[PDB]
């Protein structure tokens, strides 16, 4: 019988391995079979494109995919739609303008709300500080980055609703660990009583952790990252970072599979002029 396929960005790290495991568990629950793939050449747009082309010419009734880029899978996804394959976009949004021009569509898009991610980091801080609140800072990504501005907005709006919080600094460190160490050093020098710092990514958070240690404030300042990369997860366990907000890869994969399977049951792929289904899967707070 026709099966399902999933194309992931890679299979070489715990995030994507956990997505694979989420998919496998949900397939058992739904009683469907799934084959999970990643491109042979890591990070290579063309390698992933060739993989997806080939998979579209097998016997899969649906394919879910996490594209390496908005740009790389437009044409074979359009062809797969024309063939009646049920398609679900995971994680990184395909270039939907170009996909429409190419004569295709997808059933659904499944990702995480970056506004909520920033709110979750700020909410951790708010809850931990309690009624007495205090001075806090945000270490931003590069200005104009969609994901980074969403995280900054969400954290800022969450802090604003908490009367007891004073946002004393919000400054970019451009996704860079060395810059984050420098910015955080400057921020802590100016406001030595800061009680917490939210950073828009873990690369920057690790730099901030060093800044806090250099000031003698490890265990006295809450340091919160975003992504849950392995090095930052170790810092959380060690007390060098306090928490990090991550996506829930297992839930992204399970949700994507269920949407694919539900669509397939309808007997016809989504019309070209219909907006795909849209799911923003809840993020998770990592504190151990
Ligand atoms: Zn198979
Ligand atoms: Zn506002
Ligand atoms: Zn400096
Ligand atoms: Zn843990």
Explain what you see:
The chain has 288 residues and is an alpha/beta fold. The chain has 2 domains: 1-110 and 250-278, Response regulator (Rossmann fold); 111-249 and 279-288, Response regulator (Rossmann fold). It has 10 helices and 12 strands. It has helices spanning 14-30, 45-56, 74-82, 96-101, 114-129, 146-160, 177-190, 202-214, 230-238, 249-265; strands spanning 3-8, 34-38, 60-65, 86-90, 108-111, 134-140, 165-172, 196-199, 222-226, 243-246, 277-280, 284-286. The protein has a 6-stranded parallel sheet, with helices on both faces. It has a 6-stranded mixed sheet with strand order 7-6-8-9-10-12, with helices on both faces. One zinc ion binds at residues 157, 160. Part of the binding-protein-dependent transport system AlsBAC for D-allose. This is D-allose-binding periplasmic protein. Its main location: periplasm. One of its GO terms (molecular function) is monosaccharide binding. It comes from Escherichia coli (strain K12).
